[PDB]
Structure 1
Amino acid sequence: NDSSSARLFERSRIKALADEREAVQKKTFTKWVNSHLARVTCRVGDLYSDLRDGRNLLRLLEVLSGEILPKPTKGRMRIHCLENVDKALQFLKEQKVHLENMGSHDIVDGNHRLTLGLVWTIILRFQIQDISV
């Protein structure tokens, strides 16, 4: 009746297959975003920290769409960061990237599966929908 410890092994391999996905996928995004944020001369060695503020995700959306997005207050504080990603989410819900756990705090916290879960949905609506210029 040993499905429990087998669940401790399986779920470790659930997210092992998801990390083997999300890391190569993060580098798909990484060379994809450094093909774009290099227009504004920003280089990404880490999605989860560079685009963490939201304003840097705003820089990406200003590159991809070739447009301008508002840059509200930023600093140390949480509200500083959440507002910035709430403008990114303003343009991303404008681009119909839903709030299916693709969040403000998810970018601020750098949530490994939803920061990439947001911006890979940005890839799945850049080469599908008009996040491009």
Structure 2
Amino acid sequence: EDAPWKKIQQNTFTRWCNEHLKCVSKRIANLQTDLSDGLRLIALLEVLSQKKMHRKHNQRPTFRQMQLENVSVALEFLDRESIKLVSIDSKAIVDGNLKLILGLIWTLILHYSISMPMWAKKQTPKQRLLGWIQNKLPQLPITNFSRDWQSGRALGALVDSCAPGLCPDWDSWDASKPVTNAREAMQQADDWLGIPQVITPEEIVDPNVDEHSVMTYLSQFPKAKL
């Protein structure tokens, strides 16, 4: 983690998180520290499930035993809801294990933002979303969530697919201007489709952008049932 690209998933997951907590008045500044007492994790779970937790929690969790109980309430909720998790336990969150915490948020995005608004038992959520984009853009070979998006042009194309007239000249856009294109597209999706910029233009056309960051951004397109 010298290289500035390794930070993209973290940036993007965190903006994803804030987007869902912005109306219950919380925000994360640092995912490694700001979920450790369990309170913001609970705020997030409640907004995404549109439910309330099954039992009470420690509203003022001054010491670690209380923070572990809080986190164990988020985690049981998730068992209760049938969201399987990747090697997650309470101490992982309270102790600030960043790789496990990034993985938890990904499990959430994958479930709430991709798997749940798409209804295909033998169809993976990566596959559902791939298929949704391919259906909006039948004239583009769309096979991945990285290199296909690097020029900015598939973005123009998807946004215009969704609201024709927003990026009508996408196919004449200069692929040597990947940031300019990305920004033009993603602003038009911001302004006219409601799609927030949880990944930045610079980040989305980065040579080493990870697919999970890009899926996070794109998954907002059909959860907004376009």
Instruction: State the TM-score, normalized to the length of structure 1.
Output: 0.73
Q: Contact 1:103/1:118 (CA < 8 Å) preserved in 2? A: no
Counterparts of 1:24-63 in structure 2, within 5 Å, are 24-63=8-47
Conserved in 2, the CA contact under 8 Å of 1:55 and 1:88? no
**Residue in structure 1 matched with residue 61 of structure 2 by the alignment:** 75
**1:26-85: CA deviation from partner (whole Å, max 9, x where unpaired):** 111111111111011112211122222112101001111122124422423222011111
Q: 1:88, CA displacement in angstroms?
A: 0.5
2:18–2:26: 8 Å Cα contact kept in structure 1?
yes
Which of 96, 111, 116 aligns to 2:97? It is 111
Unpaired runs of 5+ residues, structure 2, are: 118-222
State whether residues 38 and 74 of structure 2, in contact with CA within 8 Å, keep that contact through their aligned partners in structure 1.
Answer: yes
CA distance in 2, matches of 1:129, 1:87: 23
Off by >6 Å, runs of 4+ in structure 1: none
**Structure 1 pair 60/25, CA: closer, same or farther in 2 (3 Å)?**
same
CA distance, structure 2, for counterparts of residue 31 and residue 83 of structure 1? 26
Helix, strand or coil: the match of 2:15? helix
- After superposition, the CA RMSD in angstroms is 2.5
Deviation at 1:130, TM superposition (A): 4.0
Unaligned runs of 5+ in 1: 1-14
1:116 and 1:76 map into 2 onto residues whose CA distance is: 24
Of the candidates 94, 112, 118, which is equivalent to residue 126 of structure 1? 112
Cα separation, 2, equivalents of 1:20 and 1:112: 16
Q: Give the AA of the match of 2:36.
A: R
Q: 2:71 aligned with 1:85, yes or no?
A: yes
Q: Is the 8 A contact 2:31 2:98 kept in 1?
A: no
Distance 1:99 1:64, change over 3 A: closer
Query: 1:99 Cα deviation (Å)?
Result: 4.6
What is the aligned length?
A: 116
**Amino acid in structure 2 at the alignment position of 1:65:** S
Q: Is this contact kept in 2: 1:52–1:107, CA < 8 A?
A: yes
Q: TM-score, normalised by structure 2?
A: 0.46
Seq. identity, %:
41
Compare CA radii of gyration and give the structure with the larger one: 2
> Counterparts of 1:16 and 1:117 in 2: how far apart (Å)?
20
